[PDB]
Design a protein around this ligand. Sequence first.
Ligand code: ATP
Ligand code: ADP
Lengths: 755, 131
Amino acid sequence: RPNRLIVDEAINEDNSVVSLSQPKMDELQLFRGDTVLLKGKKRREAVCIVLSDDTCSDEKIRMNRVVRNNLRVRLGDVISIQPCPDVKYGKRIHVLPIDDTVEGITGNLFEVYLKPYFLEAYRPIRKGDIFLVRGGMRAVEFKVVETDPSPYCIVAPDTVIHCEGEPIKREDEEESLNEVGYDDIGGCRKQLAQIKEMVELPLRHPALFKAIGVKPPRGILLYGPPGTGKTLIARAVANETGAFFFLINGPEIMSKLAGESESNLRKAFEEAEKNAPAIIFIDELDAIAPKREKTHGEVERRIVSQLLTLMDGLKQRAHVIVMAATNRPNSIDPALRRFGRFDREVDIGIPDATGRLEILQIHTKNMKLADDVDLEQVANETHGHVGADLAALCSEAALQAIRKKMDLIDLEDETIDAEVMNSLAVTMDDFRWALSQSNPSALRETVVEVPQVTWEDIGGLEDVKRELQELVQYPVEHPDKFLKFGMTPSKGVLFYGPPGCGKTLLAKAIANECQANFISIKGPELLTMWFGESEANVREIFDKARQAAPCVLFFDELDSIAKARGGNIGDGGGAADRVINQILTEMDGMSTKKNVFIIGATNRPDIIDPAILRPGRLDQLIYIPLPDEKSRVAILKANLRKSPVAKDVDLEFLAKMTNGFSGADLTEICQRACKLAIRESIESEIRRERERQTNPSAMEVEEDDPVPEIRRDHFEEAMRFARRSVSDNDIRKYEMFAQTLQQSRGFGSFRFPSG
Amino acid sequence: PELLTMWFGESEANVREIFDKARQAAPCVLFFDELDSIAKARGGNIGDGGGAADRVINQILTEMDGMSTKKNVFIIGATNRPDIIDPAILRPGRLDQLIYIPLPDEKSRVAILKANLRKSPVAKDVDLEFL
Ligand SMILES: Nc1ncnc2c1ncn2[C@@H]1O[C@H](COP(=O)(O)OP(=O)(O)OP(=O)(O)O)[C@@H](O)[C@H]1O
Ligand SMILES: Nc1ncnc2c1ncn2[C@@H]1O[C@H](COP(=O)(O)OP(=O)(O)O)[C@@H](O)[C@H]1O
């Protein structure tokens, strides 16, 4: 029966869309823009407009929240769709605003909300429906309580609208909107899908899996920075799927006087079990269940034991599911990890770049913005923030925008109308001012992401590029060849050469190309850890790396550790021993199933311990040659890609004269030339100012002042202060180590043996 | 590396539990690795874990002296730098029987080659002797 359709989540947010595939259009021979009749649960009736969408399957109907609530149904149910061509243009419509939707407006609903939303829409409406309208910066619901014809009718230009009277009393099963939904979350699509897949089935079908007799999960942990929306996620899931959300807070429990707390806890569970399949969310667990050594008195231990017993004693039976929110999965007591206890754990990573953009779009939805708005730049510059941070920044930007208009917006009072405040076009001045008074929260926090470094960013070292491609991409792309041959790919790769010159650039480029997460470990912070934490810290670092598989781990200046071992002190070597032992133990603990490459950059391979250089550890050593002519030319071109042009010299000529210079030196030379150009522009502007004061308002057009390009004079200025970063003895020692390696693997030519 | 980690702090209980676990699983063959790492850290530019290393080795010696001949559990130690080893280990009752491992050659090389060359893609190969 290709007429009943299973309702699911939708893509179009318009109030009058039911999405059908083109074969479905062919099936019923329906028109586009025609009204169709929808029948569902609670004996509800709806009228809607058919729209085209090839994403939905033939048996799938895509349809938003407003009309889904109009039928008083949720996703996953079955509805009946039929043609309704007998609809005709409406005559009069009397609507009535909801009580808690128009507070603090004092305006003409016709000329701000009714006129634009109802314009050229032709949305069919039936008596009893509720429709939401976006406004200046608020969204307001209206309930159509009378219409001609009744109950179903067509919104037409020849309709008189009456929206005067006492607000209608709130309904009961109307499933009031303005609640959190799946769309209301940005930047966490992967985790959202992961949690949706393994939670929806037991709740939507409490008896189906019971008939299957497969034990569902009972406890899920969510950990991350505070204020990232974990409570928001839980509330949205409860609202969307349909459940009996029951929130309990740890500080509330701690506020009570001992025993009743536990009783309250008991009450909570006996509340949820008797109210059908329900969902329980508990927050700030470490605040009530920290590590047992952190626990000092006996009351907290009693509470912990009580909650453990309560949660274990409800093993399945009732379909209640509980999740918890915390900061990190390393502060709570470890006993809350057993089978049947909290076992499935999820991290909520910091939104970055794109996710920040969707967060802004979600928050910057209602208030009207100026055409100057450039959200992409804001998302680029803003990092180390959370959804709450961006919401606060948007709030303060709106406050600044309104504040500067007191004279125009009648600073006194007189209950400013909606259209007057509508004029507050948000400007980049407001955003910059808000950013001036801005404070991030994450800051000193590890970030896992995919960098955006391209292959053309470097001279190329095409042999090394191909070798790394062979090492990484093919093993995961085509495991069949290895499993047939029985070869296990290596894991630890090391680089050595002049300081810098692409190492980190190579790591970022390969991470970007392979489309895998990147984790960086720095020598300075390594030595910071070196005093104190040396065993646990590596443990959670590698646990985090394992969780983000597939990913690539990078180590910067590993020899710095041996720099403490071999240096001007040579006395704190116990910590270095601890670090090395931890690293080796973890490397031996790395299973072959995990696909995580490890890269290490070392300037001096000789000082470092050769014990690392063994099978099952870092084995592939790649030398870094100095940039040479064409490589230098490409590097200079990449540097010049920023803004100015160098159409006054010969780049390869300069490379010829500047042999033996690292790419870092070339970038520094470019920066010096840029500084000279900036100073030239500044002095040209100063001369313009001087001639302005000598003759007021003489001439103000743009003179031949330095615009973005590097003239030759700047080039001599830059080349004069050119640095030979690497001394010859450094090349001597690099080639000494290379020849040491070659002598071991030394077999002069061949003779085609066994011929 | 695990032993060197156990040098600082958690040493006594680990040794006791590992020897007890070996003892209850009799008969068994306890094995050791990096037996020269203790002496490698004993003499060098670190000079930090020497006290912990000496404590660990003393504990090991005492506990292995503490076993009863009833338990049919054997002990095997391996190293590649035997000179740096403390003579106290090379004592009666302690490790006394010593075996040198000569490098493979020809017959040994061909044997290890033909023992490791299982794989799926054997091709048809050539003479292992000249290899
Ligand atoms: N992806 C997002 N989309 C929309 N709003 C978001 C998002 N992430 C965070 N927010 C906002 O940040 C705030 C987070 O609120 P809330 O305290 O409920 O979150 P939380 O992460 O569960 O908090 P907690 O610190 O208690 O663990 C809210 O104002 C919410 O609107
Ligand atoms: N376009 C480029 N081509 C090649 N090398 C580059 C380019 N841009 C920057 N580099 C190199 O990247 C290096 C970064 O240095 P640094 O991060 O301190 O050491 P490492 O690269 O070993 O991590 C610089 O020394 C510079 O020479």
